[PDB]
Structures are given as structure tokens and as C-alpha cells.
Write a protein that binds this DNA or RNA. Sequence first.
RNA 1: AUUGGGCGUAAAGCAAGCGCAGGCGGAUUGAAAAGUCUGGUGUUAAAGGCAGCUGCUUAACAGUUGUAUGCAUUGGAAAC
RNA 2: CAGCUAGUUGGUGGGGUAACGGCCUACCAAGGCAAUGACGUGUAGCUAUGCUGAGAAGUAGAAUAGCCACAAUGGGACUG
Lengths: 153, 203, 136, 141, 83, 87
Amino acid sequence: FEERIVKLKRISKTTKGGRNMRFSVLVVVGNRKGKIGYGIAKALEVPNAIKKAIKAAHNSLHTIEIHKGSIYHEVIGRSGASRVLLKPAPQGTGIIAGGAIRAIIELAGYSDIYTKNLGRNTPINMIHATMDGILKQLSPRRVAILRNKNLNE
Amino acid sequence: MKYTGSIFKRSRRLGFSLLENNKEFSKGKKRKTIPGQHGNRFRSSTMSGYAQQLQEKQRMQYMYGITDKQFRRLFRLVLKQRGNLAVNLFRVLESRLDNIVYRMGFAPTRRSARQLVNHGHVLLNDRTVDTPSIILNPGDKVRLKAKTIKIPIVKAASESGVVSPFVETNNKTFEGTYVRFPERSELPAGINESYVVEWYKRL
Amino acid sequence: ATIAQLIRKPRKKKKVKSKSPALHYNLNLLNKKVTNVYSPLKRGVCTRVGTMTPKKPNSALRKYAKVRLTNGFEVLTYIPGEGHNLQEHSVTLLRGGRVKDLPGVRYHIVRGTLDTVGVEKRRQQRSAYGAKKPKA
Amino acid sequence: ITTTKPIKAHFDPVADLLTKINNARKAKLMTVTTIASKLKIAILEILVKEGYLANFQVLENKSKTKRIVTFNLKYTQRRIPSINGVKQISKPGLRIYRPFEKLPLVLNGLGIAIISTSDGVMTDKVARLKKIGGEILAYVW
Amino acid sequence: KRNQRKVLIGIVKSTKNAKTATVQVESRFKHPLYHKSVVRHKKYQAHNEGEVLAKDGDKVQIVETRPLSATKRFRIAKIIERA
Amino acid sequence: MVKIRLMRMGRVHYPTYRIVAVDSRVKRDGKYIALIGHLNPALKENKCKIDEAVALEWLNKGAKPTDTVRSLFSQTGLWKKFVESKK
RNA sequence: AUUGGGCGUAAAGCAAGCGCAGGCGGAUUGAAAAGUCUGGUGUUAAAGGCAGCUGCUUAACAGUUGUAUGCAUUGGAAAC
RNA sequence: CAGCUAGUUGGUGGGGUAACGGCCUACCAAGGCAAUGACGUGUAGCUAUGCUGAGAAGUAGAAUAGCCACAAUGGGACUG
């Protein structure tokens, strides 16, 4: 649980005679062993927005598995016309990715992984594509159970 | 240039003792603020990944007395082989002749030890040396040339020296040996070598 | 498209052009012909010296030059620094680089070159504007 | 028996099969009908010996003029199929041909690839054991 | 006997030129980077010896030889029936 | 005449010759047919190993050694296995 | 964008039709075997690249050995 | 850049050439190449390789090496 932020944005809506500059923030929090959650929340000042985002993130976590410290099979993260590629790197190479990708993967307590952005690069879509790719991943035990070849084949 | 102007300022901003523990040990009321006219309050406001990664890089190469391009060459050479990255890189950096002279404890500082090495005062495996970038391997024997022992600066270090278990020495005969590779926890750990090693995507 | 179509019609790149082509063309005498040998920098001789106003966001008065290359090309060029030594048919030397304030102008003078003497009283970075190391 | 409903095959057998299997998987259906071909047969049994689908019976009329085949897909009580993704590399006019030394492994071995080298359909791992490369039918994972 | 041969089945287009026939060949090759397969024509030349008068539709075989003349470079080896 | 000559393959001040089966009408350090060991005529005490396999074939189908190649052919005993098998 | 892109409103489906050439094309049985797959042989200069090693006080560097690739030809296979 | 080519296409006799050959020669016929791009335009020594890229490969042909062409420019031939 390091709750590293990724990007704060000075968003604003317009009202008669003035601008409601209400900057928000996106945060990623991870137990470093499988718990991952992200929080986007809007507030008038930094610390309260940070607290709201952390509460939203830690409220809704979810688990993920470890295969030699890394993903084991190919996947493409399809989310809102923004693809991110994940490849099962060999053990030694270590983490290599951008800002949000490194945030998500390291906060997941992973290791070696091969990454490359495709299409857009707005952080929220990056996070969505990465989570969708990481969760649509099937475990070999799960596919083995639904197969008749569960005996390591 | 291969030599640096001031050393305590480096420990000031880097926040890492260039010495064992006496870099900021209240020497003349030693401090820990960043140097320059603006040490009042720049605590942590723009702590980015790139900033701290540069911080660990400079920490890694200031206490070794290295410069950029040769450090890049060292990283490439250690990347040439097979194994784990950070520990092998640190092994190569601890295979430097002057660093092993410092670990011998024969000189009070790495700068004096480096001058003694350059000036021919150091003889390795019955061979004189003039290159501080020689690569030492396990089971390599070292002596003090059996010459120019009459130095006031080498003595008080020679008797008073911390014999780390990874390099053994004989005080009176001034003989040393690089037997086993130093371990990660054996050497100062105020340096996060990982941020350095994956700070290089150069190749 | 379908491979049955790309075989008929192969792909083509965009073939981006140089940011400044005038410094690339060369032409000799004695059967003159151009061989565009992509020179980093060509000399020249100024022909017109004056000033022009910049565009909308800024408001200043930038002294410009109209120099003829070692070849036949004529280019607008902006002077650097505080003051200059343009001498109305003074032989100069040219340097690339865009200027946003001046449309059309796409070059600078290497200052400290053959004739255009570098600006004196320069001590910060001392490379542009051609100032030697001051005596300590 | 007596399906009493007219059916017609789309086009090339591999695609005609993959489209139906994917649509059935998405629509949560049980079985689909199509005309039968020897290659389609071979792929059907090589799949079922991997346990990726239920009953498949080739059927003919009271004659040997028309032969059709249907198949059910491996499900669970929680109603989730055994198939995750399907994609063909071979394509009409875009046939792929792969030597054994460059044979691809689907999803680090979790998936299944169909490689009809010389003796019909066979698994990618058993072909690697055979060290026989060749044409590749489709990806199944 | 170490001389080589190129067994390439062709097709005779027209032998209108006196006692010389024109053969057409179709080699199937993979396009270098598109990996598709396409077959191209490349006309070749062989002169009529007189054994058989190849009309339109005769497809035969060809063997290498010395240069018999410019643009007439190969000779017939084996003849296959009509269709 | 195909000549067994020397080829100065090496850095400045450090000749390191590979012995070469090269034709007479070929410049120095040029393309050849077969390779004949090598030489480092700075290190002494048998730093001059030669293949001995195809060199004898070259000599048996036409070859001309040189004085520095005469030296190497002398100690290794090429002559005592060449001029007698000649008869 | 072959691996690796799209064509409703963001650039992009011709105004529509008849259509030669070309591209692709139902099912079954046999043969041949061009492609397709694999076996042998020949060949694909050195240096250079990779890896090891040797020698330079060590890299810079010099040298050694091994290392791919493609093609021709030859034995088979016969799903497509 | 839509036609291009008349020793151009093919045969006969002779000469010639280290040798094959419209290469030339005397005779006969009009053929041949071409949308799978002929002919033309401009460009350029080719290859190993260098730089980059994970890769499919993009890119220059540095030192150097194999092959090719040249020797103020254009032709000729002896001798070897």
C-alpha cells in the first residue's frame, strides 16, 4: 500500500462571472502482493481530493495472481480505443514501462514485464486498459479445471 | 575533470555520507541542508522519478570517484555477461583496484589511495600497476610494492584498518587478497542500486 | 486493404523535406550544376540590412538581413545579440534555425565569424554572439 | 434426425466453422448446424480430443448426396464456455506456411494451434515432438 | 555426367517464325515481403527440329544447351501430349 | 605461381601473420583459396602453430614457399615428409 | 499499419449499372507432386556482428575457435 | 513515359573468332519485345558491411575487402 499518485488535472467548469477551478487527481494504491485499486475524485483543494481518491481506490480493490513474478501469456488491453501490450518477460530483465504502466505494475508487486503503449495516452484510459488486460487473463489452473487435460497437459 | 572540488557539499545535497559516518557528524556544527544560498526550504516539492534516479546515480558514482562515460562503459561491460544485474554491477565496481586499496584500509581516504596507486606505490600480483580501472578477480594477491612504506599517511591507516571479510590482508607484510565478492548488506546500503540499474535503457 | 490490392499498388512514405534547404545546395562554375550536398553551413554576403516587426503575440523590432549564399540562393536571416556589424556588402557566414517571431526568416548569422564581429561585454555561455573568455 | 430446417454453408471451411463457434460462444447457445467436410471433420475430432466441445455427429440424408454436422460446446453448470478466443492465421489468398524451427506457441502453451503438416490435423506440441512444421489452420485459446 | 538441367514444363504459343517455336513458362514464387503467392510468365525460345509440328496447345519440356543464337537459347528435351 | 606468403593482419607495431596460400598475381592481405595456420612473430617458443592438413596438399599440387615460410617449414619437419613422399 | 491502420458525423465507399482480364471460389474419389513439410549433399571469401578464449599494465585494441543465412541439387511425405 | 524495334526475328551458304552466336557476310520471309510495364526520363558503381531497430527491416555504400569501369577527351591497332 504505497498509494502513489500519477496525474493531477486542473479541470474547470464555467459559471456566470468566474471559473470553478476544481483540480482533481488520479491515484494508484497496491499492497504489492495482489491488491490493486485506483481512485479518481474531484475536490477544491489538493489534500481533500487526495483523501477522496484514496478512499475510493482502497474501497474497491481486487486480487491478481503471481506467475514467477510476472504475467505468463500474451494479452492486449482493449479499453476505449487505447491499447496497451503486456508480454511475459524473462525473469531477469525487470520492470520497463511508462508512468502509469510502471505505477500499476509495480504497485501490483510484479517484476519483469514487457510493455508498449498503443493509441492514446491519457492516464485514466491507460489504467482502464491495464486493469482490463490484467483481469481478463485466465489462470492455467482455471482453464485446466474446465478442460479434461487438467493433469499438467 | 577526474577530480572534484568539494566533497562535503556532495554529501550535503545527495544526503549520503561520502565517508563512513563522519561526513555530517557535527564537524564544525555540520548540517544536512542542501548547499547554496537556498538551503532554507526545498525539502520535497518536485520529487520526481527522474530526480531521485539522478540522485541515486550521483550517489553511486561520487563515492566511487568515477565520471560519466567510463561508468557507462562499466555498465555495458557488466551487461555483456550473464547473471543478476545489480549485484554483478556492484561486484565490478568493487573490483576496482583503488576501491580494493581503500578496503585494504592502507590509506585513510580513497583520494589518497588513488594517488598512491597512480604514483606507482601499489604492486599487484608481483606486477606494478598504473591504471585504477584494473578488474580484480577472486584469488588475486596484492602487496604494497615492498617499497615507499615510509609514508606518514599510509601507516596510521595500515595498523588501524577495518578488515572486511570479503578481502583479507596481512598488516606487517602489507599483503592483501581479493578472496570473495562483497555482499549487498556488507557495504553501505544508503544507495538504492536498483533505481540506477533500471535507469539505463541505453542499450 | 486486401493483399490482392497492395500487390497492385505498393505503399509510399511521406518523404518529409529538409527544415532549411538553402544550406544544402552547392553550385560551381565551369559547367555549373547543382548537387545539393547538404552542407551544415554556408557563407554569404549581405545585400539588404534593416528591421521588421514580429507577429501577433510579440511586439518588438528585430533587425534582419538579406544575404546571398555561396550559391545563387537568397534567404532572409535574423541577427543575434546586442548590436551588429552589418556593413552593406559585408561578407558573412550563415546558420540555420527557425524564428517564430518573424515569418519567412529561417536563419541566423554565426556571430564571431569572418566579418560580423561578436558582441562584446558577453560573459554568459560566451559561445553564441562570439565572445572570447574574459581576462580574470 | 429430421432437422426440418434448411441450412447452407458460408464459405471456406475454417472460417465457416470459426464464425459459427464464436457466435455460439457469445450468444451462449448450445449447438450450430453446418455442412460437413473432411477438413472440418478432422478439426472437430482434434478439438474434442482436447475436450473443447460436446457431442458432434455427422449426419446424412437417406442417401450419400448431402452430409451435414452439428456440435455442442463444452460448458459448465455456471454456464461459462471452455473457449476463450479464436483467430485464424490461414486465410483464402493469405495462406501461412511455417517451418518447425519457427513454430509459434499459443499463449505460452495454454492455447491450441492447428497445424496440418502432412497427416492432417495435429496439436502444436505433438508436432514439435514430431519436429514437423507446415501450414497453420487457426489459433484457439 | 555432371551437366545440369532445368526441367520446366512450358506451353507453345506460336511457331509462325520458320522452324522456331515460342514457349511460355509459369513459375510460382512467393512475393518477397508480402508472402502471398503469384505466378508470372516468361517466354522462352526453342527451334523446331522437325520431329513433331507443335500446334497451339502443345506443352513440352526444355533442356539447357550452348547459345544457338541471340534470343534463341534453349532446345527441347521431352514432349508431352496435347490436351 | 601460387606462393605461400605472409599477411600482416594486426595493429600497428604488432604484426600477426596468417600464413596464406595465395597466387603470385595478388596484392598483400588479399583474398585467397585456403588458410594455413597463423603466426605471431613477436611471441617466441612455438607461437607458430600450422594446420599441416591442406598445406601439404597445396605443396603436392603446386606451391612455392618463401624464406620466412622456409623457416616454419624447416622446424616442423615439412621437408622430411614432403621431399621423400615426392619420390 | 506483412507482422501492425481505417473509410456514418473527425481525411477517406466512385452517382449507379453491364461487364473482359485478373484475384478468390461447393462436396466426393484417384494420380501426379509445382507450392507446402522434413532427410542427405554441395555451396554461401576474409575481416566485421554474436559468444568464449588468448595477448596487450586493462578497457580503446589486436588475434584464435565456434556461431548463423540463402540457394541449387538429391530421398521421402501427400493434410491442404 | 503507349507502342518499341528492320541485323531487329528466324532460316540457308561462306568467313570470322580462344569458342557459341546476324558477329559479319550473299540469298529468303516479316517477324520479335510489350500493361506481369516494353521504349523513355532522371537517378546510381554492385556486394560484404557501417548506423538504427526487438523484429519484419529503414538507411549510407566511410576506412577496408570481392567484383566492375576509367586513365586530359574520342577512336585504331601492333607486340605480348
